[PDB]
Design an enzyme around this catalytic site. Structure first.
Site, PDB file in Angstrom:
ATOM      1  N   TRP A 173     -51.675  83.384  49.852  1.00  0.00           N
ATOM      2  CA  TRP A 173     -52.897  82.615  50.025  1.00  0.00           C
ATOM      3  C   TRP A 173     -52.861  82.001  51.422  1.00  0.00           C
ATOM      4  O   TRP A 173     -51.880  82.148  52.154  1.00  0.00           O
ATOM      5  CB  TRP A 173     -53.029  81.569  48.911  1.00  0.00           C
ATOM      6  CG  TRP A 173     -54.442  81.229  48.585  1.00  0.00           C
ATOM      7  CD1 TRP A 173     -55.145  80.150  49.029  1.00  0.00           C
ATOM      8  CD2 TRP A 173     -55.334  81.976  47.750  1.00  0.00           C
ATOM      9  NE1 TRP A 173     -56.419  80.176  48.522  1.00  0.00           N
ATOM     10  CE2 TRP A 173     -56.562  81.287  47.732  1.00  0.00           C
ATOM     11  CE3 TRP A 173     -55.214  83.160  47.013  1.00  0.00           C
ATOM     12  CZ2 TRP A 173     -57.662  81.741  47.004  1.00  0.00           C
ATOM     13  CZ3 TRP A 173     -56.304  83.607  46.295  1.00  0.00           C
ATOM     14  CH2 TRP A 173     -57.515  82.901  46.298  1.00  0.00           C
ATOM     15  N   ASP A 174     -53.939  81.311  51.799  1.00  0.00           N
ATOM     16  CA  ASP A 174     -53.893  80.758  53.171  1.00  0.00           C
ATOM     17  C   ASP A 174     -52.938  79.548  53.293  1.00  0.00           C
ATOM     18  O   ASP A 174     -52.878  78.957  54.391  1.00  0.00           O
ATOM     19  CB  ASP A 174     -55.291  80.386  53.674  1.00  0.00           C
ATOM     20  CG  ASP A 174     -56.002  79.373  52.796  1.00  0.00           C
ATOM     21  OD1 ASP A 174     -55.371  78.820  51.877  1.00  0.00           O
ATOM     22  OD2 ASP A 174     -57.207  79.125  53.045  1.00  0.00           O
ATOM     23  N   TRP A 175     -52.197  79.211  52.230  1.00  0.00           N
ATOM     24  CA  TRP A 175     -51.117  78.232  52.312  1.00  0.00           C
ATOM     25  C   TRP A 175     -49.867  78.672  51.556  1.00  0.00           C
ATOM     26  O   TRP A 175     -48.947  77.860  51.391  1.00  0.00           O
ATOM     27  CB  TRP A 175     -51.582  76.874  51.767  1.00  0.00           C
ATOM     28  CG  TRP A 175     -52.498  76.995  50.592  1.00  0.00           C
ATOM     29  CD1 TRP A 175     -53.825  76.683  50.557  1.00  0.00           C
ATOM     30  CD2 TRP A 175     -52.165  77.475  49.281  1.00  0.00           C
ATOM     31  NE1 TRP A 175     -54.337  76.935  49.310  1.00  0.00           N
ATOM     32  CE2 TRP A 175     -53.340  77.422  48.507  1.00  0.00           C
ATOM     33  CE3 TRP A 175     -50.988  77.949  48.688  1.00  0.00           C
ATOM     34  CZ2 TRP A 175     -53.375  77.820  47.169  1.00  0.00           C
ATOM     35  CZ3 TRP A 175     -51.024  78.345  47.363  1.00  0.00           C
ATOM     36  CH2 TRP A 175     -52.211  78.279  46.618  1.00  0.00           C
ATOM     37  N   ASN A 439     -63.220  79.484  40.625  1.00  0.00           N
ATOM     38  CA  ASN A 439     -63.289  78.832  41.922  1.00  0.00           C
ATOM     39  C   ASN A 439     -64.122  79.683  42.875  1.00  0.00           C
ATOM     40  O   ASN A 439     -63.785  80.842  43.132  1.00  0.00           O
ATOM     41  CB  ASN A 439     -61.890  78.616  42.495  1.00  0.00           C
ATOM     42  CG  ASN A 439     -61.924  78.109  43.922  1.00  0.00           C
ATOM     43  OD1 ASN A 439     -62.165  76.926  44.165  1.00  0.00           O
ATOM     44  ND2 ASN A 439     -61.689  79.006  44.877  1.00  0.00           N
ATOM     45  N   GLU A 440     -65.226  79.112  43.359  1.00  0.00           N
ATOM     46  CA  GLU A 440     -65.989  79.558  44.524  1.00  0.00           C
ATOM     47  C   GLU A 440     -66.643  80.927  44.382  1.00  0.00           C
ATOM     48  O   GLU A 440     -67.203  81.431  45.363  1.00  0.00           O
ATOM     49  CB  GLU A 440     -65.118  79.560  45.786  1.00  0.00           C
ATOM     50  CG  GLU A 440     -64.850  78.155  46.297  1.00  0.00           C
ATOM     51  CD  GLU A 440     -63.947  78.123  47.506  1.00  0.00           C
ATOM     52  OE1 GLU A 440     -63.299  79.154  47.794  1.00  0.00           O
ATOM     53  OE2 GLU A 440     -63.887  77.062  48.162  1.00  0.00           O
ATOM     54  N   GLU A 537     -63.773  69.604  46.604  1.00  0.00           N
ATOM     55  CA  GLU A 537     -62.800  70.021  47.608  1.00  0.00           C
ATOM     56  C   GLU A 537     -63.242  69.529  48.978  1.00  0.00           C
ATOM     57  O   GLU A 537     -64.438  69.508  49.282  1.00  0.00           O
ATOM     58  CB  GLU A 537     -62.639  71.541  47.687  1.00  0.00           C
ATOM     59  CG  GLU A 537     -62.034  72.224  46.481  1.00  0.00           C
ATOM     60  CD  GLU A 537     -61.753  73.689  46.770  1.00  0.00           C
ATOM     61  OE1 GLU A 537     -61.752  74.058  47.966  1.00  0.00           O
ATOM     62  OE2 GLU A 537     -61.540  74.468  45.815  1.00  0.00           O
TER      63      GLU A 537
END
Ligand SMILES: *[C@@H]1O[C@H](CO[C@@H]2O[C@@H](C)[C@@H](O)[C@@H](O)[C@@H]2O)[C@@H](O[C@@H]2O[C@H](CO)[C@@H](O)[C@H](O)[C@H]2NC(C)=O)[C@H](O)[C@H]1NC(C)=O
Ligand SMILES: *[C@@H]1O[C@H](CO)[C@@H](O[C@@H]2O[C@H](CO)[C@@H](O)[C@H](O)[C@H]2NC(C)=O)[C@H](O)[C@H]1NC(C)=O
Ligand SMILES: *[C@@H]1O[C@H](CO[C@@H]2O[C@@H](C)[C@@H](O)[C@@H](O)[C@@H]2O)[C@@H](O)[C@H](O)[C@H]1NC(C)=O
Ligand SMILES: *[C@@H]1O[C@H](CO)[C@@H](O)[C@H](O)[C@H]1NC(C)=O
Ligand SMILES: *[C@@H]1O[C@H](CO)[C@@H](O)[C@H](O)[C@H]1NC(C)=O
Ligand SMILES: *[C@@H]1O[C@H](CO)[C@@H](O)[C@H](O)[C@H]1NC(C)=O
Ligand SMILES: [Ca+2]
Length: 862
Positions: A173-175, A439-440, A537
């Site tokens: 993921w981006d983290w 989510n999203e 968020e």
């Protein structure tokens, strides 16, 4: 008497595809953690091992065990093998007989082994690579593509995670890293029985507005041993409510469900469950006793919590659209919290002790809400038990996130079991205040994130409704009407449903909730933020401390743009974005020692992160009671994100390992129940008062200015006619800037700093706040601070007495990897002398703390 259960958790064997590797493996456990534990690999989180250990995730591993049952087969009608969690795709061989397969990490599995079980048995789980499986499933889906097929290159991840029912962030993921492992991640049991077997039991406390009474709906499913009809009784008892009730039951192969409705005698008072900071978390002990024909007794205990939740989407005068806020037991409550992500790449390492510690940090940050984000997992039992007991409300996503998903029948079959299993598992927790379909993904289609051909959009729209409405929503509502359900986050709520489940603009501030990010504009300019109904968020990125990085890096890695650092950064241009926002109001580190520059840059990204989210959160806090330009009534702020999954730059306030970033200290302050927040609009300094209190509070607002030269107030404005209404926000101060400076002679925007505070009881936490009249990179008269510290022990706590040569902004105390956190940190130190505490999480010593200690202030960076 006719029931037997014991766990097969313990020491198994694990072996790779061609059998070259074979080692001991704990269950619950994963391949990576077994290999690491056995010394066959390094720490997967070390430097570049996410790339070096890719081969682990691509092979096919087998978990094996041999055991001798502790009972006689001839004494039992039926024997079952039960798995609470398998990650993810596996063929299950029992005594070399295939008894089933798995394809879903988030569902329990039950297998009848009556006819294959022996006195000595072999159990093998032949797992398939999650990466290879996901790719093959993508291939088989020939009729059309399902995006996104592959993650951004800067995530260093794997493709097609949307085709496997596994933690959606496990492919990077981006983290977070890509360690898509294989393992038995929950308990395994043998269970033998005669007569009947309790497959599951679930209950739901509800309030009947009609009856003005409390009830408990109970549903239990049994597997009956034979074709005959089992009779018996069931007694539900809640002693502390003077409640007891017995009913007749009967079980048959085609009538295997028991449904009860216990009514709580209105004669007795039922104390309700409340979120932290808004009441008690009181619950009641309960027992369910099945007494069946033939001596079979089956008892289950549980704790019953009584509370009501309403998602209120009502009209607002002068504000087009609908509200979006939560009433708990009739009281509107501003959501204060953050988004929860998985605490580790390998769930067997998220121990009870780690979790309890993390929830202490959530509590100490004055949070009352966590969003279990749909790219993680349905969390372990103790997560929701802690939420119930500590009073943390849970915004519960289902595990779909930022991706489109197939509607192939096998996949939907898999999803139905998962959702059915998890809803029955979770619906009795009072902490869960809302179900969220994904989510999203409403945004992804509404805006077409994945640039689908407008010719095939109809296919993806129908796939969306099929998944979240025709399957997930239908299953949820068939089990639970005590909680609101939304199909996605962010959403427009009732307006989204009206519009056919994919809103025209899901980011609308006039409906539902929103997610908001922005890295280009000045985060201090609160006008960039949307005055939304609820912000689920919003975040800014920062680097974790050097102490956290040191454990997975080497000397040559300790530069902001080293090969290692750019490798760990999984967010497009995050390093530049972070510096860009630092430069907005701060001087970049100028120094000769590169290591010093590295550490100072980290410090400044945490400075930028903390002040940015402070500014943003306080804007939402003050917008709760007001309408402005048709916008307002903000009733929630959950920032992205709470925690880290590994050591890397992220939006978190809790570094991997639990260490507090500066943001978390600021969080404890801006989530206080009574808070003054200051800002400017077109040259006028304002101060609102923010209250989470249930009664109107009368206090005293002091305002002061200070020259950077010394801690002497050049003025002291003190209005004592202050009243903040219950749970509201209201303007309490208002003045031009020119007028404010003249009333404090010797002050310039670039020379003075604003400060303000309430005067509170000692029973009420309302901290100091402050406001900057200009960028600190332009501050004049900012004397170089030289802070001295004396460390001492007092009981289980250590005392840190400080002294500064100058008004020091962003004093940062750091004791490296010594587990603990300070009473306060990153504060603006107007005073000359302060005292803060340090709370150890393991036994430490004053010597250890002195040797690792370091204090930093803004001037030390240039
Ligand atoms: C930075 O501070 C230390 C300590 O300063 C002391 O504490 C102040 C709050 C104040 O009480 C001062 O009078 C103290 O000196 C400085 O270290 C001292 O240096 C002097 C000589 O200038 C020496 O006589 C003392 O023994 C030193 N004290 C200690 C504890 O080391 C230091 O020089 C200051 N400046 C810099 C650039 O580091
Ligand atoms: C409700 O049940 C729990 C047990 O699950 C009770 O808490 C226990 O209390 C005893 C002594 O009172 C302790 O020795 C145990 O360690 C406790 N167990 C746990 C899990 O906390 C609790 O007292 C019960 N409440 C009532 C009113 O009976
Ligand atoms: C194991 O059994 C094999 C035949 O059984 C079939 O294959 C196994 C793997 C299971 O999937 C079972 O359900 C099937 O019916 C034999 O070919 C093989 O030699 C056996 N191996 C040993 C070591 O006995
Ligand atoms: C098994 O595969 C690995 C590849 O990772 C290889 O190194 C090893 O030699 C192989 N062993 C056998 C017995 O084929
Ligand atoms: C893993 O199993 C799949 C299916 O059985 C197979 O196609 C693949 O080649 C295997 N991978 C390895 C590394 O053995
Ligand atoms: C909440 O708990 C307190 C104990 O701190 C108790 O005295 C009080 O009666 C409880 N309040 C309600 C409303 O039940
Ligand atoms: Ca919206």
């Amino acid at each position: 008497h006719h029931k037997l259960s014991y766990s097969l958790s313990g020491s198994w064997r694990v072996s790779n595809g061609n059998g070259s590797l074979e080692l001991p493996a704990t269950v619950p456990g994963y391949v990576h953690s077994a290999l690491h534990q056995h010394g066959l690999i390094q720490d997967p989180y070390y430097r570049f091992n996410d790339l070096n250990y890719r081969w682990i995730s691509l092979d096919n591993w087998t978990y094996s065990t041999e055991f001798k049952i502790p009972f006689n087969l001839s004494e039992w009608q039926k024997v079952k093998l039960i798995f609470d969690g398998v990650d993810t795709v596996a063929e299950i061989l029992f005594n070399n007989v295939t008894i089933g397969k798995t394809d879903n990490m988030f569902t329990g599995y039950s297998f009848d082994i009556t006819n294959v079980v022996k006195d000595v048995n072999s159990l093998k789980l032949q797992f398939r690579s999650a990466v290879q499986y996901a790719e093959c499933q993508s291939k088989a889906h020939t009729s059309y593509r399902v995006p996104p097929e592959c993650p951004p290159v800067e995530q260093k991840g794997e493709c097609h995670v949307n085709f496997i029912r596994k933690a959606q962030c496990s492919f990077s993921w981006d983290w977070g890293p890509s360690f898509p492992s294989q393992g038995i991640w929950k308990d395994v049991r043998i269970e033998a029985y005669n007569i009947a077997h309790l497959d599951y039991l679930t209950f739901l406390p509800v309030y009947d507005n009609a009856s003005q009474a409390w009830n408990i709906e109970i549903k239990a499913s049994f597997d009956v041993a034979s074709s005959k009809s089992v009779g018996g009784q069931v007694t539900v008892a809640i002693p502390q409510l003077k409640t007891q009730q017995t009913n007749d039951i009967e079980l048959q192969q085609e009538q295997r469900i028991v449904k009860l409705l216990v009514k709580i005698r209105k004669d007795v008072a039922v104390e309700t469950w409340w979120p932290r900071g808004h009441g008690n978390q009181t619950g009641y002990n309960m027992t369910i006793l099945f007494a069946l024909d033939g001596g079979l007794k089956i008892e289950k205990a549980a704790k019953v919590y009584f509370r009501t939740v309403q998602l209120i989407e009502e009209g607002i005068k002068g504000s087009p659209g609908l509200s979006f806020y939560f009433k708990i037991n009739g009281l509107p409550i501003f959501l204060k919290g953050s988004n929860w992500i998985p605490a580790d790449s390998f769930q067997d390492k998220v121990t009870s002790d780690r979790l309890q510690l993390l929830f202490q940090s959530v509590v100490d940050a004055n949070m009352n809400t966590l969003r279990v984000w749909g790219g993680g997992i349905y969390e372990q039992d103790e997560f929701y038990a802690l939420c119930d007991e500590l009073g943390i409300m849970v915004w519960q996503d289902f595990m779909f996130a930022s991706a489109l998903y197939p509607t192939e029948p096998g996949f939907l079959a898999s999803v139905r079991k998962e959702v059915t299993y998890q809803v029955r598992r979770l619906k009795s927790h009072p902490s869960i205040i809302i179900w969220s379909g994904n989510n999203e993904n409403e945004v992804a289609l509404s805006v077409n994130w994945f640039h689908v051909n407008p010719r095939d959009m109809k296919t993806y729209i129908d796939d969306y409704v099929t998944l979240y409405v025709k399957n997930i929503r239908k299953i949820v509502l068939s089990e639970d009407k005590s909680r609101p359900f939304i199909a996605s986050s962010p959403t427009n709520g009732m307006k989204t449903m009206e519009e056919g489940w994919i809103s025209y603009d899901p980011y609308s501030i006039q409906y539902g909730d929103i997610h908001f990010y922005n890295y280009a504009d000045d985060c201090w300019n609160w006008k960039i933020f949307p005055k939304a109904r609820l912000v689920s968020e919003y975040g800014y990125q920062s680097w974790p401390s050097f102490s956290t990085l040191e454990k997975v890096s080497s000397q040559e890695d300790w530069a902001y743009n080293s090969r290692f650092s750019l490798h760990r950064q999984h967010h497009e241009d995050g390093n530049h974005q972070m510096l860009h926002q630092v430069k907005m109001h701060f001087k970049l580190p100028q120094g000769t020692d590169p290591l010093r520059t590295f550490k100072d840059t980290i410090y400044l990204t945490q400075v930028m992160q903390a002040q940015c989210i402070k500014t943003e959160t306080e804007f939402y806090l003050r917008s709760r009671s007001e309408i402005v330009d048709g916008k307002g009534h903000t009733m929630g702020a959950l920032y992205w994100q709470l925690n880290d999954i590994w050591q890397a730059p992220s939006w978190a306030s809790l570094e991997y390992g639990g260490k507090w970033k500066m943001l978390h200290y600021f969080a404890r302050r801006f989530f206080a129940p009574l808070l003054p927040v200051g800002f400017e609009d077109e040259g006028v300094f304002y101060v609102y008062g923010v209250s989470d209190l249930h009664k109107d509070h009368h206090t005293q607002l002091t305002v002061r200015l200070h020259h950077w030269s010394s801690p002497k107030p050049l003025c002291s404005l003190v209005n004592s006619s202050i009243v903040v209404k219950a749970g509201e926000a209201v303007v309490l101060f208002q003045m031009p800037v020119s007028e404010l400076l003249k009333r404090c002679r010797g002050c310039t925007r670039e020379t003075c700093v604003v400060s303000f505070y309430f005067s509170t009881d000692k029973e009420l936490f309302s901290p100091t706040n402050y406001h900057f009249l200009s960028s600190l990179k332009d501050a004049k008269g900012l004397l170089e601070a030289n802070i001295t510290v004396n460390i001492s022990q007092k009981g289980n706590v250590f005392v840190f007495d400080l002294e500064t040569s100058a008004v020091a902004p962003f004093v940062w105390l750091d004791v490296g990897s010594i587990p603990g956190r300070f009473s306060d940190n990153g504060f603006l130190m107007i005073r000359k002398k302060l005292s803060v505490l340090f709370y150890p999480w393991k036994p430490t010593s004053k010597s250890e703390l002195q040797q690792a200690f370091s204090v930093t202030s803004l001037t030390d960076t240039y």
